[PDB]
Amino acid sequence: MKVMECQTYEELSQIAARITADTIKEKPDAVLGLATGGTPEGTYRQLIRLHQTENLSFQNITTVNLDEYAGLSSDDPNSYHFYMNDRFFQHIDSKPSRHFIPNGNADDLEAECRRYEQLVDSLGDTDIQLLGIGRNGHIGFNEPGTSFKSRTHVVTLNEQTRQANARYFPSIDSVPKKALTMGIQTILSSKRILLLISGKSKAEAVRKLLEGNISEDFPASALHLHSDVTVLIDREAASLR
Structure with a gap:
């Protein structure tokens, strides 16, 4: 695991964009x-x-997203479909049909997860996977106690996760209870992983990650099993290391 300390969030973001562009x-x-x-x-x-x-140019790229909230339609402003379109897809020259995200408004969520796992396999897996880390070490919405063999699945969000994400919602009462997420094994199948970590809130998780103990109680520790992981950490997140 290659750790790079970044002076600022802006530097982190520039470095991450450059690694992503390299992949493209x-x-x-x-x-x-x-x-x-x-x-x-x-x-x-x-x-x-x-x-x-x-x-x-993004003309030829395909994308796969980590996750989506259960029960949100793509036109809901808190859906991850909406996020991706707003922050990224609308601004680039890709083919919209090659952007894939789990369908939180499928009739059968378990079946949707199986179909999404099959889709990712059919693409030949990812060339790079961008990740964040939860305060509790989660990756995707793979919470503490998730098997390292997990595949795409429906999950019930931990209270800490709903607490953290409420900042994007009108109130806590609007935050969904469930989500669909790529599993840990799904993520580990990527050729390259880029883990981005920013802010003092993640300083406890960075400490745990770098110490190297492996357990399902800290999902991000699964990344110690991967052959090509880069971790970018800004100064604030590196403050309790």
Whole structure:
């Protein structure tokens, strides 16, 4: 696991965008695994800037997202479909049909998860997977106690996760209770993992991650099993290391 300490969130975001662009340009038709939340927002902004300043083309890319909330339609402003379109897809020259995200408004959520797992396998897995980390070590919405063999599945969100994400909702009472997420094994199948971590709130998780103990009680510790992980950490997140 290669750890790079970044002086600022802006530097983190520039570095992450550059690694992502490398992936896009390394081969005609890359498959990118993407993530939402606060942490990658700068990375998306910088990727869009590269589209303008370095003539970066997304014409041939395919993407897969980590997760989606259960019961939210794609036009719901808190859906991850909406996030991805707003922050990224609307601003680039990709083919919209090659952006894949779990359907939180499928009739049968268990069946949707099986079909999504099958879709990801059929793409040949990802060339890179962007990740964030929860305060509790979660990756995707794979909470403490998740098997390292897990595949795409329906989960019940921990209270800490709903607490953290309420900032994006009108109130806590609007935060969904369940989500669909790529599993840990799904994530580990990527060729390359890029874990982004920012802010003092994640300083406890960074400490635990770098110490190297492996247990299902800290999901991100599964990344110690992968052959090509880069972790970008800004100064605030590195403060309790």
